[PDB]
Amino acid sequence: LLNIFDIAGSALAAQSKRLNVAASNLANADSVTGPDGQPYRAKQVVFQVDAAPGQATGGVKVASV
Amino acid sequence: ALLNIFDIAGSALAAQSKRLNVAASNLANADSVTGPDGQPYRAKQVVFQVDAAPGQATGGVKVASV
Amino acid sequence: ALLNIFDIAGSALAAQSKRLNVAASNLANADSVTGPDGQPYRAKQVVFQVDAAPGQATGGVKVASVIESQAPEKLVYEPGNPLADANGYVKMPNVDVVGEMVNTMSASRSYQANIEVLNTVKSMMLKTLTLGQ
Amino acid sequence: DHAIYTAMGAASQTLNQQAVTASNLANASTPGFRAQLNALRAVPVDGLSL
Amino acid sequence: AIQGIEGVISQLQATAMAAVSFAGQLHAALDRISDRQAAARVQAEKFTLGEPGIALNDVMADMQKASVSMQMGIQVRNKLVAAYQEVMSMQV
Amino acid sequence: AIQGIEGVISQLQATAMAAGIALNDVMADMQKASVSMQMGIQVRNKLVAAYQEVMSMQV
Amino acid sequence: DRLDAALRFQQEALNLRAQRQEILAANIANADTPGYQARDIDFASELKKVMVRGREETGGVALTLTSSHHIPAQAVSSPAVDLLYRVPDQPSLDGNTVDMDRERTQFADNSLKYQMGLTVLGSQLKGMMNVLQG
Amino acid sequence: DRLDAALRFQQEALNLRAQRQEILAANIANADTPGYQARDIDFASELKKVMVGVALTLTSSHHIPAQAVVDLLYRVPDQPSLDGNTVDMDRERTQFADNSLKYQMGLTVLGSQLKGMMNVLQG
Amino acid sequence: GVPGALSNQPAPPNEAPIATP
Amino acid sequence: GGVPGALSNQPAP
Amino acid sequence: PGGVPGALSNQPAPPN
Amino acid sequence: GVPGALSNQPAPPNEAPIAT
Numbered sequence: 001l002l003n004i005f006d007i008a009g010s011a012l013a014a015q016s017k018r019l020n021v022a023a024s025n026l027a028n029a030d031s032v033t034g035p036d037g038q039p040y041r042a043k044q045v046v047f048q049v050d051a052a053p054g055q056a057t058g059g060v061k062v063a064s065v
Numbered sequence: 066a067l068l069n070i071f072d073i074a075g076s077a078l079a080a081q082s083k084r085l086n087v088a089a090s091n092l093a094n095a096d097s098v099t100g101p102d103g104q105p106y107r108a109k110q111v112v113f114q115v116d117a118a119p120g121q122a123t124g125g126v127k128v129a130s131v
Numbered sequence: 132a133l134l135n136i137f138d139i140a141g142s143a144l145a146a147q148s149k150r151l152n153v154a155a156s157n158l159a160n161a162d163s164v165t166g167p168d169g170q171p172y173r174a175k176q177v178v179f180q181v182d183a184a185p186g187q188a189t190g191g192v193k194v195a196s197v198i199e200s201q202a203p204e205k206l207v208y209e210p211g212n213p214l215a216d217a218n219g220y221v222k223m224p225n226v227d228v229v230g231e232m233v234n235t236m237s238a239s240r241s242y243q244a245n246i247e248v249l250n251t252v253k254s255m256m257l258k259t260l261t262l263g264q
Numbered sequence: 265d266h267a268i269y270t271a272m273g274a275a276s277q278t279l280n281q282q283a284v285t286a287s288n289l290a291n292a293s294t295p296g297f298r299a300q301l302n303a304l305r306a307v308p309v310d311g312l313s314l
Numbered sequence: 315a316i317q318g319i320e321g322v323i324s325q326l327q328a329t330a331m332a333a334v335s336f337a338g339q340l341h342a343a344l345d346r347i348s349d350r351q352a353a354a355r356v357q358a359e360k361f362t363l364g365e366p367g368i369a370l371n372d373v374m375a376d377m378q379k380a381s382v383s384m385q386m387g388i389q390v391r392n393k394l395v396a397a398y399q400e401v402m403s404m405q406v
Numbered sequence: 407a408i409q410g411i412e413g414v415i416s417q418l419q420a421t422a423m424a425a426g427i428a429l430n431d432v433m434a435d436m437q438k439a440s441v442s443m444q445m446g447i448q449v450r451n452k453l454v455a456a457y458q459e460v461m462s463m464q465v
Numbered sequence: 466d467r468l469d470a471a472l473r474f475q476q477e478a479l480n481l482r483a484q485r486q487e488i489l490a491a492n493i494a495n496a497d498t499p500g501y502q503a504r505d506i507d508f509a510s511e512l513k514k515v516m517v518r519g520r521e522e523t524g525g526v527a528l529t530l531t532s533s534h535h536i537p538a539q540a541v542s543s544p545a546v547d548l549l550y551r552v553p554d555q556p557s558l559d560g561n562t563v564d565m566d567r568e569r570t571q572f573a574d575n576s577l578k579y580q581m582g583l584t585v586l587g588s589q590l591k592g593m594m595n596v597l598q599g
Numbered sequence: 600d601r602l603d604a605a606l607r608f609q610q611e612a613l614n615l616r617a618q619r620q621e622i623l624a625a626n627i628a629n630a631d632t633p634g635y636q637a638r639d640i641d642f643a644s645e646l647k648k649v650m651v652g653v654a655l656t657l658t659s660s661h662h663i664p665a666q667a668v669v670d671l672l673y674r675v676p677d678q679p680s681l682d683g684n685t686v687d688m689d690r691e692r693t694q695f696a697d698n699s700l701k702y703q704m705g706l707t708v709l710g711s712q713l714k715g716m717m718n719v720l721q722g
Numbered sequence: 723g724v725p726g727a728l729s730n731q732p733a734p735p736n737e738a739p740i741a742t743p
Numbered sequence: 744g745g746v747p748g749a750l751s752n753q754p755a756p
Numbered sequence: 757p758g759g760v761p762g763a764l765s766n767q768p769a770p771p772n
Numbered sequence: 773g774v775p776g777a778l779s780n781q782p783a784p785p786n787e788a789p790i791a792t
Contacts, residue, residue, distance in 0.1 A: 002574065005570060005573070005574050008570070009566065009567065009570035009776075010776075012566040012570070013554055013564070013567065013775070013776065016554075016564075016566055017314060017554065017555060018266045019267055020266070020270070023267035023270050023271055024270055026265075026271070026274070027270055027271065027274035027313065028304070028306045028307075030304050030305040031304045031305060032303045032304065032305070033303065033305050033792060034305065034306045034307070034308065035305075035307065035308070035789055035791055035792045036792050040306040042564055045314075052551055062314055064266070064314070065314050066364055066616060066643070066697075066752070066753050067694070067697050067752075067753050068370070068700075068749070068750055068751065068753070069152055069747055069748065069749050069750070069751050069752070069753060069754065070151065070155055070750070071151055071693055071696070071697050072693075072750040072752065072753045072755075073152070073155050073156055074155060074159060074693070075689060075690065075693035076159065077158075077159035078689040078693070079677060079687070079689050079690060079725070081142050081162075082678075082689055083677070083678065084162075085664075086253065086678060093149065093727070096233050100244070101739055101740060101741055101742050102742045103742070112164060112165060112214075113162055113163040113164055114163065114165045114166065114168050115160050115162070115163050115165075115167065115172045116755075118164065118754040118755040119745065119746070119747065119754050119755070120199075120745065121745075122197055122600065122745045122746045122747070123152055123153055123156035123175070123746060123747070124156060124177075125156070125159050125160075126159055126160055126162075126163055127724075132428045132430075132480075132483050132487050133428060133430070133483050133486065133487070134428060134429070135487050136486065136487055136490045137375065137378070137379060137508065139487070139490050139491055139494050140375075140490060140494060141371065141372070141375040142494070143493075143494035143495075144371045144375070145369065145371055145372070145498075145575075146764065148369065148371055148748040148750050149746050149747075149748050149749070149750075150761060150762070151749045151764035152747070152748060152749035153746060154762075155749065155756055165595065169489060170436045175747065176760045176764055177751065177758070177760065177761070178758060178759060178760055179495075179497065179498040179499070179531035179758045179759065179761045180498070180757075181495060181498065181501065181758065183317065184540065184541050186524060186540070186543070187541045187543060188504075188510045188523075188543045188544075189487075189488055189491040189492075189495075189548065190491060190493050190550055191491065191494045191495070191498075192494050192498055194744075194746065195758065196560055196745075197745060197746050198760070212585055227276055227763065228270055229275050229276045229279065230272060230276060230762070230763030230764070230767070231761055231763070232447065233268055233269065233272040233767070234762040236761050237268070237497060237761075237762055238270070238497075238762075240265075241496060241497050242554070243491070244493060244496070244565075248490050248493055248494075248572070249375070250574060251485075251572075252490070253378055253381075253382065255576065255579060255580070256382050256429060257382070257385060258583055258752040259429045259430060259433060259583060260382075260385050260386060260389050260429060260433065261389075261587075262433040262434070262437060262583060262586065262587050263433070263438075263587055263591065263594075264389070264392070265564075265565045266555075266557050266766070269558075269763070269766035269767075271769070272763065272766075272767075273766070274766050276767065279767075280786060288792030298551040305790060307768045307788045307789065307790050308788065309557065309558050309787075310556060310786045310788060310790040311475075311553060311555070311556025311557070311783070312552065312553045312556065312773075312775075312786075312788055313552060313553060313554060313555070313773065313774075313775045314554070314555055314775070314785055320746050345449075355712075357710055359608055360702070361752065362608075362609075362612050362646075362704075362705065362708075363643055363646070364642060364643050364753075364756075365750050365752060365756065366747070366751065366752050366753060366754045366755070366756045367747060367751060367752070367754070368751060368752060369747075369748040369751040370704070370750040370751075371748065371750050377711055379706065381711060381715060384718075384719070385716050385718065386429065388437055388718060388719060389433075390436075393436060393440060394720065396440075397440060397443060400443070400444060400447060401447065404450070405451060405453060405454065405455075406454070426482075428483060430476075430479055430480050430483050431480070434472070434476050434586070437590050438468065438469065438472065440469065441590065441593055441597065442468065442593065444594065444597040444598070445597050448597055448599055466776065474776060497761045497762065498758055498759075498761060499758060499759040499760065499761060499765040500758060500759060500785075501758075502782050502783060507778055518764050526760060541771050547780070549778045549780050550778070550779055550781065550782045550783065551776070551777075551778060552773045552774065552775050552776060552777050552778070552779055552783070553775065553780075553783050554775045554776065554790075556786045557766070557786070558768070558788050559759070559761070559765040559768075560765075560784075560785055560786055562783055567776055567780070582766065600743075601724060614731035636732050636733065638737065639728060672728040672729060672730055673728075673729050673730070673732050673733065674727075674728065675723070675724065675725055675726060675727045675728070675729055675730075675731045675733075676725070677726060678733050679736050680736055681736060681738055682736070683735055683736045685733055690725075695743050768788060770788055771789065771790065771791070
C-alpha cells in the first residue's frame with residue numbers, strides 16, 4: 001500500500017497547488033499591472049494522471065500552469 | 066504566576082477595558098456643567114505604556130494613570 | 132539516532148514559542164504611545180537560524196536575536212496629547228495587525244506539528260525498546 | 265501553507281489602499297489639492313517548479 | 315582508622331615500588347538514569363512553583379526523556395535477569 | 407608489531423603459494439550477545455551430557 | 466560472524482531509517498525558516514553503499530581521557546550520507562523549499578518502514594531464540 | 600511512607616490548584632453581589648506552607664482513634680465600581696483559564712510518575 | 723500596588739457623593 | 744536568553 | 757543565513 | 773526536474789521584484 005502513499009501524496013500536492021493558484025488569483029482580482037507592465041492574466045493548473053508505470057490508474061500530477 | 070502569553074494578553078484586555086471605560090465616562094459627561102465640588106468636568110485620557118519586564122525584549126501593556 | 136529528534140523538536144518548539152510571544156507582544160502594544168524610557172514602542176521580530184554548529188549537517192532551529200522591525204513609525208496628528216513632536220506628530224508603533232495575527236496562527240500550527248513529531252518519535256523509541264521481547 | 269501569506273499580503277495591501285483613500289477623502293476641503301492615485305501591482309514570485 | 319592510614323601509606327609505597335568493572339558500569343548507568351529523572355522532577359517542581367524562566371516545553375520534553383530512560387533501564391534489567399537465570403540453569 | 411609485519415609477509419607468501427550510540431545499536435548488540443550466550447550454554451550442555459553418558463558406562 | 470552477517474542488512478536498514486527520520490524531523494523543524502532548502506537522502510543507494518563499505522562519519526573526533534578527572538568533550542559529528550536537495554514544488558518569497566505535504570508524507574512512510582524493520586528484526590531474533598531455547 | 604514523600608509535592612500542588620479554582624469560580628459567581636470583595640490565594644506561599652499530626656494513642660480496641668478536622672488575600676481593585684464590587688471579569692477569566700491549564704499539567708505529571716512506578720513493577 | 727496584585731487588606735468602600743460634604 | 748518563551752512563567756517575579 | 761520568519765519575509769520587500 | 777524528486781544541486785535563490 002506504499003503506492004497508495006505515493007497516490008495520496010501526489011494528490012495532496014496537486015490540490016495544494018490548485019489552492020495556491022486560486023489564492024493568487026483572488027489576490028489579483030483588482031491588479032492593474034505587473035513588473036514588466038503587462039496585465040495579470042489569471043492562472044489555471046492542469047491536472048493529468050500520474051500513472052506512467054501503473055496502467056490507467058494512478059495519482060494526479062500538475063502538468064502545467 | 067501567569068504564563069507569559071496569558072499575562073500579556075490579559076494585560077491587553079484590561080488596558081482596552083480601561084480605555085473603553087474612560088471613553089464611556091467622557092461620553093456620559095459630555096453635557097455636564099458642574100461636578101460635586103463646583104468645577105467643570107475635564108475629559109480624561111488613558112496613557113498606554115509597555116510593561117517591558119525584561120530588558121527591551123517584550124512585555125504587555127500597563128496604564129500608569131488617567 | 133532517534134534521540135537527536137528530541138533535541139531538534141524541542142529547539143523548534145522553544146523557537147516557535149518565542150516567535151509567538153514576540154508576535155503577541157507586538158499585537159498587544161499596537162495602541163501604545165510610550166515606553167518605559169519615553170520612546171515609542173518599536174515592533175520587534177525574532178530571527179530564525181539553523182541550530183547547527185560548524186560541521187553539523189542539519190539541526191533544529193534557534194532564535195539568533197530580536198530585532199526592531201523596519202517600517203515607518205505611524206504618525207498621528209494630536210498636538211494636545213502631552214507626548215508630541217515639534218509639530219505635534221505623535222509616533223505610534225508600526226505594528227501590522229494582519230501580519231501579527233497570521234504570524235500567531237503560523238506559530239501555533241508549526242508548534243503543533245513539532246508536538247506530533249515528538250509524540251510519534253517517543254512511540255517509536257518505546258517500540259524499539261521492545262525489539263526482541 | 266504559504267497561500268496564507270499571499271492572502272495576508274492581499275489583505276494588508278487592501279488596508280494600505282483604504283488608508284490612501286481615507287487620506288484623500290479627509291482633504292475634500294483642502295484648497296488646491298491633488299488626489300493620490302492607487303493601484304495594486306502584482307509581483308510574480310520566481311522559482312521552481314510550477 | 316590509624317591502622318587504615320597505615321594501610322594507605324603502605325599502598326602508596328606499593329605504587330612507588332611498582333613504578334571500571336561491570337558492577338561499576340551498572341552503578342554508573344543507574345546513577346545517570348536517577349540523576350536525569352531527578353533533574354526532570356526538579357524542573358517540573360520549579361515550574362509548578364511559579365519561578366520565572368522555566369518553560370512548559372522544556373518541562374514536558376525533559377519528562378519525556380526521563381520516561382524513555384527509565385524504560386531503557388527496565389529493559390536492561392529484564393534481559394540481565396533473564397541471562398542470569400539462563401546461566402544458573404546450566405547443569406554441571 | 408615487528409612480529410605482526412612478519413605475519414603479514416607470511417600471509418603474502420601463503421597467497422603466492424595458493425596462486426553517541428543509539429537505542430537501535432544498543433538493543434541489537436544486546437540481543438546478539440544474549441543469543442550467543444544462549445548458544446554457548448546449549449552447546450556446553452550437550453557436550454557435558456555426552457561426557458556424563460560416556461562416563462556413566464559399565465565397561 | 467555468521468549471526469552478525471545474517472542480521473546485518475536489516476540492522477543497517479533500520480539505522481538508515483533512523484538517520485532519514487532525523488533528517489525529515491530537521492526539515493519539519495526548519496519549515497518556517499526563510500532560506501532553507503529541504504534535505505533528503507536516497508535510501509536505496511545509501512543503504513547499498515553502507516552495506517559494501519562500513520558506516521563512517523565526517524569527524525566525530527573527541528578529547529582523549531587518560532585520567533579519571535579529565536573533562537570529557539566531543540566536537541561535531543554526523544553520518545557519511547549524501548544530503549541531497551529536494552526539488553521544490555512551488556516558489557516562495559522567503560526562499561525555503563520545505564513543502565509540508567511532502568514532509569509529512571515522507572515522515573509517515575518512514576515511520577511505517579521503521580516499524581516494519583523492527584518487526585522483521587524482532588521476528589528473526591525470536592526465530593533464533595526458538596532454535597536455541599531447550 | 601516513602602511512597603507518600605515522592606508524590607507529596609504533586610498531590611499538594613493539585614489540591615491547591617483545585618482550591619484556588621474553587622475560589623476563582625466563587626469570584627466569578629459573585630460578580631454581581633454589591634459589596635463583595637474579590638479574594639484569592641498566593642499559590643507559591645501556600646504550597647510552601649503545606650509542603651513544610653499527632654494521632655491520639657489507642658490503648659485497646661474500644662478506645663476511639665483521633666478524629667481529624669489556607670489564608671485568603673484580597674485582590675487589588677483595578678476600576679472603582681459604584682456598588683463596591685471589585686471583581687474584574689478579564690483578570691479572573693485569565694486566572695481561571697491558567698488555573699485550569701495548571702491543574703491539567705499537574706494531573707499529567709502525577710499520572711506520569713505513577714505510570715513509571717508501575718512499569719518498574721510490571722513483569 | 724499594581725492592579726491585580728495580592729494584598730492582606732480589603733479595599734475601602736466605593737462612595738460617590740453627588741454634592742460636596 | 745533576552746526573550747522569554749510564551750509558555751514560560753511571568754518573567755516578572 | 758536564516759532571517760525573520762513569517763510576515764516580514766513573505767511580503768514584497770523594497771528593491772534595495 | 774520532477775517536483776518531489778531528489779537532485780544533488782541546490783535550487784537557485786528565488787526573488788519577486790516589483791519593477792524590472
